[PDB]
Design a protein around this nucleic acid. Structure first.
Lengths: 186, 289, 52, 160, 122, 213
RNA sequence: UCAGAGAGGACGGAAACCUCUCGUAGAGCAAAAGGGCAAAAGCUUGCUUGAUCUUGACUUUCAGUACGAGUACAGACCGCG
RNA sequence: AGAGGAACCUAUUCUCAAACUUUCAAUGGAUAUGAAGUUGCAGUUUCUUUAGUGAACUGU
RNA sequence: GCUUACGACCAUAUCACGUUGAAUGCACGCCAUCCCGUCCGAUCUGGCAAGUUAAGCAACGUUGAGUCCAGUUAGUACUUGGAUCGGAGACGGCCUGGGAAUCCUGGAUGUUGUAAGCU
């Protein structure tokens, strides 16, 4: 009896216009593992790819195995929002052949992948620069996330308004006709 | 994975103050803003609260007590349509007008408006109400809340409006619009233009030249109100003149009857009855499954 | 020949022998240690009040 | 022998109450203090400036000076066979108004008001002295629905 | 309530109780002394009583006895006018003097048995 | 050699547990604390016997283990390993101290007298009070005689006086046998291995349904 | 906003860096221990020299001496905002 | 020490703390309980306040 | 019966899941020329008003956890003062007065001030 009305009202609410999943941001990372010319060239690569200067991340500790010293710049990262983010994500998914694994999506509703060589991203190779691999991470979220991020009177997003793994997977499949490969042999 | 928010966690948890939990009051700054020296005893210390909502500007005068602040005067941008403006009630010009309205209103109320007229010629130059006669000018200290203190902010626009209205608000021109942080120079002409809304008219013209559709999408209700890029400055000047001419608060209406719109809390008997009904239903389902 | 031997045995008895003397009642009249600005203003006020 | 530091042995004395740490509520500063008032001293560990000495914690004193954010207090301290009226400058956060004196002031106000009212109305002067509770007077107790119960001591039982 | 705590404090060293008419009259007549200018003066005449308590309308040993027995408005003056009674040791002796009355001893509140004790002591 | 127990018999000092301040404490002699059919279900052993102390003294780990072995051997030989469940309800946590002194001729040359006489750890003893339960055991009603005889044999290994009694409770649980039976028949007591848990009323009816009480 | 946990991402692994959730302080605050601290007293950063000149009062030890340390003011000239 | 999902999680369980504690006595410490007080009126101040606004003082 | 600004007490106010939300309002929201700040108009800042109660927020629901109050524990534990009191002692009771706290049980789930507004 009342279950039918409850279910139909829930579906109608879910069909609200403010609940659309959208690409909140795309984060590009390159951990070169050391400082100097290689790091500078990786920063050059990222600048070429996105169009905005990246930021250098420094080591937090010292590890002899990694040859890494504390406070040394070892990574270059950037964050892109909007149509440029969509274009770069499309290029990355073309490189990955629009194929992803079930385990690549996080329980919160984001997902990432990596490219071994940035030449595959439609960037002309430069002998001076070289070849760099990089990490793509797409963070999706609906409108209204500003509640949790604004300075004045932050709140917490409602459970129904939060995103989930299978919803992110459906978004990926529908937008990009993405393929979900079988889990990798453990 | 070990559960973090467990019984012991909740037993030991201490909740912050209500307004800090609500993220609405900064108590560190409040203590310094509101506490009066003990050798001045119960003499009120006056604070000019400035707040900007998504659609309105709120300016208030208050002083603190053990059982809550005492607001003595207030002025809102949504109250400007009585002095003209129907739209753009949040921009720099609206903020300055609201501040001026608050200042004139409270000076009228406490009977000092005739003695202190403030700066009646908009020029954008820094103005500090100078003491006249024996009665010193009314004094208030600015309270911005959680707003960021950037150069040319509308909170400082409201503060400038109040100071021009003629209330002694200690301040410096550093964070007014037209102050160059690099060269530390103050452009009174630029500040006056921003107060009069020339930036809004410039944006109107820019969008009109660029694209008609975007211009309409951006200034839809401005056009409906009949405000274009050649009338806004005069409109703001007229608004200032009207505010200075009259500043008494609007009259109050009658109290309409009220009816419950929300659910009322169940009683003890109702709750126990619901418990019994759920118990019976669950037993029925268990038997039938 | 240890000779430290601290104690508080008979001290309360000695103190109460002559009674415990409570503070006088004029100690609250002096303005010693009061704010200099307030004392200055008080001096000015007292200097000027007309006797009749 | 013990060390003679300022805060020796104040581990629990200067600590905050359980689930009571953090920001200090502002009625503490809004409270009005005037010279001649009585105040209790209770150190607030969260404010390391203007702290009273441990020997004055929990003691009541009289204000003799009111500065910007502190007060001078005269507190009695026992030193051998004399009680010294020591003067201490304590900040507001370590201070709380004393209620004994305000209760006495209320009683005096009520006494004066009753006397004035009776005199104006022509009544005799009423009694305005606190009296020790007198022994209970004579009365009668009824057993209706309250019949006495016979009580006897109980036997010992091995409660394993 | 302002005197019972004192009795509890001094329980081990005193025997006290509720005096009766005969006890009060015997105490006042046989062992009555007045504090007159700091001097212990035997009360052999009603004029001695009247000189000190005449202001409060107590003029005779009977008036003093009534004041004491009924706890009149001038009980304080009436009693403080009397020198502390200096009683004789009871004829028959004590019992323990180191245990409460309920323990079969002597100290503490013996209620109306103080009259029995005073019939020997006085 | 170990000092006589009479030296550390009575409780005189404050508790001295092994902690960061007291280091180099030798391991206590008694390690095992639950013997017999310890993994028994709650209903296997409804009868229960306690062995209380009548002295405020120190029960050495040595004495505790001696009594443990004595009772365990007696019960293993008389009733089988799986017929009882014995629980030593007292853990040695108090540390005693010894101020060692040389006992040879001419020792006075190197002896330090009473100067700086603070001792070093010697052993672990269990502080006991009047009414404290030293040993407890749960068995079948047909083995109470063996229980009492075992506790009798064991008590002579402890200093002072001990009293052997039979408890009205259901085994080691906290309910008298009649109330335990009634509550279990009702469904208010859920098995907790050796013991049981009370299933209180309040809470969500969703978990209520899993066991309607 | 910390310690830490969970879940994701080329080389990258238990451990490099990036991302999102949770996180009452379980971190950090030069040092011993104990108090205190969450739009801070912690981290990042801008500007600075109040770690300056001057006299009294007071607390601590206490004989109510001194030194040392500290507290609340008063006068001057400044720093940040 | 087992119980329900080798470790792990959950709910339990036996026994403890001079340098553990949510809670917390009895004894104990301190302050106040009027004339050096309470109400008003009528003056002073260069202190304080936008302001007789306060604070304090003064008065045969 | 509610909304906002500023508050007082600082969980009876917190936390989890869910239902509802009239009007004002708050909020999300659109844009980024200008002021302003960022790797990034995400935050901050500025100009706006197409759209939404989806979230925040408010009210309500839960034999909800927590918190708070009360009962019970119990005249119990402990304790002031007394004894040429019992006992080898450890300790124990009696006389004289104070007098708790867990488990467990039941109930409550913010109150309120100034100013402005809706109904």
């Amino acid at each position: 009896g009342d279950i039918e009305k409850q279910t139909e009202i829930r579906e109608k609410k879910a069909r609200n216009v403010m609940r659309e999943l959208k690409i909140q941001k795309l984060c590009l990372n390159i951990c070169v593992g050391e400082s100097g010319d290689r790091l500078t060239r990786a920063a050059k690569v990222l600048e070429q790819l996105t169009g905005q200067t990246p930021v250098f991340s420094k080591a937090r500790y010292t590890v002899r195995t990694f040859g890494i010293r504390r406070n040394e710049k070892i990574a270059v990262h950037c964050t892109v929002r909007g149509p440029k983010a969509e274009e770069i994500l499309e290029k990355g998914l073309k490189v990955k052949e629009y194929e992803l694994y079930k385990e690549n999506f996080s329980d919160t509703g984001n997902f990432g992948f990596g490219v071994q060589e940035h030449i595959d991203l439609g960037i002309k190779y430069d002998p001076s620069i070289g070849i760099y691999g990089m990490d793509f991470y797409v963070v999706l979220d609906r409108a209204g996330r500003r509640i949790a991020k604004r300075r004045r009177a932050p709140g917490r997003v409602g459970p129904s308004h939060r995103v989930e793994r299978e919803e992110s997977i459906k978004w990926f499949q529908q937008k990009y006709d993405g393929i979900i490969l079988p889990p990798k042999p453990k | 994975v070990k559960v973090i928010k467990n019984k012991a966690y909740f037993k030991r948890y201490q909740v912050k103050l209500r307004r800090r939990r609500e993220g609405k009051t900064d108590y560190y700054a409040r203590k310094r803003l509101t506490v009066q020296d003990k050798n001045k005893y119960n003499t009120p210390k006056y604070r000019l609260i400035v707040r900007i909502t998504n659609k309105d500007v709120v300016a208030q005068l208050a002083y603190s007590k053990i059982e809550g602040d005492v607001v003595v005067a207030s002025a809102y941008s949504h109250e400007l349509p009585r002095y003209g403006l129907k739209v753009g009630l949040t921009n720099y010009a609206a903020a300055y007008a609201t501040g001026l309205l608050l200042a004139r209103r409270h000076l009228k109320t406490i009977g000092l408006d005739s003695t202190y007229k403030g700066h009646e010629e908009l020029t954008g130059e820094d103005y500090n109400v100078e003491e006249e006669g024996d009665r010193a000018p009314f004094k208030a200290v600015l309270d911005i809340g959680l707003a960021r203190t950037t150069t040319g902010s509308k909170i400082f626009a409201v503060m400038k409006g109040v100071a021009d209205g003629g209330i002694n608000v200690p301040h410096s021109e550093s964070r007014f619009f037209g102050f160059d942080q690099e060269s530390k120079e103050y452009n009174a002409e630029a500040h006056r233009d921003r107060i009069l809304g020339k930036h809004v008219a410039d944006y109107m013209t820019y969008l009109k030249e660029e694209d008609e559709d975007r211009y309409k999408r951006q200034f839809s209700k401005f056009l409906a109100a009949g405000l274009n890029a050649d009338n806004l400055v005069a409109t703001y000047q007229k608004v200032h003149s009207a505010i200075r001419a009259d500043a008494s608060p609007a009259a109050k209406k009658a109290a309409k009857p009220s009816k419950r719109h929300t659910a009322k809390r169940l009683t003890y008997d109702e709750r126990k009855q619901r418990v019994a009904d759920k118990k019976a239903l669950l037993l029925q389902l268990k038997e039938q499954q | 020949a240890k000779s430290k031997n601290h104690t508080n045995h008979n001290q309360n008895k000695k103190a109460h022998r002559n009674g415990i003397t409570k503070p006088k009642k004029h100690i609250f009249l002096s303005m010693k240690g009061v704010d200099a600005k307030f004392i200055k203003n008080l001096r000015f006020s007292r200097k000027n009040n007309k006797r009749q | 022998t013990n060390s003679k530091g300022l805060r020796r042995g104040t581990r629990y004395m200067f600590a905050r109450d359980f689930r009571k740490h953090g920001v200090e509520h502002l009625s503490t500063y809004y409270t009005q203090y005037k010279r001649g008032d009585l105040v209790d001293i209770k150190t607030n560990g969260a404010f390391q400036k203007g702290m009273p000495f441990k020997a004055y914690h929990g003691r009541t004193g009289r204000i003799f000076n009111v500065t910007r954010g502190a007060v001078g207090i005269i507190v009695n301290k026992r030193v051998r066979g004399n009680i010294l009226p020591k003067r201490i400058n304590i900040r507001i956060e370590h201070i709380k108004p004393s209620k004994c004196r305000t209760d006495f002031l209320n009683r005096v106000k009520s006494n004066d008001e009753k006397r004035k009212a009776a005199k104006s109305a022509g009544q005799p002067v009423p009694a305005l002295k606190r009296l020790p509770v007198a022994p209970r007077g004579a009365h009668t107790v009824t057993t209706q629905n309250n019949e006495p119960e016979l009580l006897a001591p109980l036997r010992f039982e091995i409660v394993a | 309530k302002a005197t019972l705590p004192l009795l509890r404090i001094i329980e081990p060293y005193v025997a006290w109780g509720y005096p009766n008419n005969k006890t009060i009259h015997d105490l006042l007549y046989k062992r009555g002394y007045a504090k007159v200018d700091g001097n212990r003066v035997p009360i052999t005449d009603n004029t001695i009583v009247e000189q000190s308590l005449g202001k409060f309308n107590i003029i005779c040993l009977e008036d003093l006895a009534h004041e004491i027995a009924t706890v009149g408005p001038h009980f304080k003056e009436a009693t403080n006018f009397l020198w502390p009674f200096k009683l004789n040791n009871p004829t028959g002796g004590w019992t323990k003097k180191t245990n409460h009355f309920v323990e079969g001893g002597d100290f503490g509140n013996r209620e109306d048995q103080i009259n029995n004790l005073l019939r020997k002591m006085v | 050699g170990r000092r006589p127990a009479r030296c550390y018999r009575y409780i005189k000092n404050k508790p001295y547990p092994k902690s960061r301040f007291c280091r180099g404490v030798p391991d206590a002699k008694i390690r095992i604390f639950d013997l017999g059919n310890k993994r028994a279900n709650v209903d296997t052993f409804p009868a229960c016997v306690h062995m209380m102390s009548n002295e405020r003294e120190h029960l050495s780990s040595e004495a505790l283990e001696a009594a443990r072995i004595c009772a365990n051997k007696y019960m293993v030989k008389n009733c089988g390993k799986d017929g009882f469940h014995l629980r030593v309800r007292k853990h040695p946590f108090h540390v005693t101290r010894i101020n060692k002194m040389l006992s040879c001729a001419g020792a006075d040359r190197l002896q330090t007298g009473m100067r700086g006489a603070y001792g070093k750890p010697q052993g672990l003893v269990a502080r006991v009070d009047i009414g404290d339960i030293l040993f407890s055991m749960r068995i079948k009603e047909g083995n109470v005689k063996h229980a009492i005889e075992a506790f009798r044999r064991a008590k002579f290994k402890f200093p002072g006086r001990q009293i052997i009694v039979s408890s009205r409770k259901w085994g080691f649980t906290k309910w008298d046998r009649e109330d335990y039976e009634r509550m279990r028949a009702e469904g208010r007591l859920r098995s907790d291995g050796v013991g049981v848990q009370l299933q209180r009323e309040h809470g969500p009816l969703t978990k209520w349904i899993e066991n309607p009480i």
